[PDB]
């Protein structure tokens, strides 16, 4: 256990960094998708209705 908490620390840091990167990219992509959905709603109101 004394020497197993240093490699596990590296694994934790790497996996946390991967998760944070995924969440950030997904947030940006979700912002883009929200803009596209707002455009779709505007087209539905202005043109279909």
């Amino acid at each position: 256990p004394p020497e197993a908490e240093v490699q596990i620390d590296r694994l934790i840091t790497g996996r946390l960094q991967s998760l944070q990167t995924y969440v950030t990219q997904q947030l940006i992509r979700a912002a883009e998708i929200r803009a596209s959905a707002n455009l779709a709603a505007t087209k539905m109101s202005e043109c279909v209705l």
Partner: protein, 50 residues
């Protein structure tokens, strides 16, 4: 101005709008015209005179 965009500034035919300040934002009061009390009639594309 008065907008012809559908549902851009309220449900109905837009008449006018009033802005109000609010904490960290704006509040639009959209005054719009809504038809009501419909009645059914017989219609025709055109009327044939002589």
């Amino acid at each position: 101005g008065q907008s012809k965009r559908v549902d851009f500034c309220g449900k109905g035919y837009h008449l006018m709008s009033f802005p109000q300040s609010a904490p960290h934002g704006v509040v639009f009061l959209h005054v719009t015209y809504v038809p009501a009390q419909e009645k059914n009639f017989t219609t025709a594309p055109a009327i044939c005179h002589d």
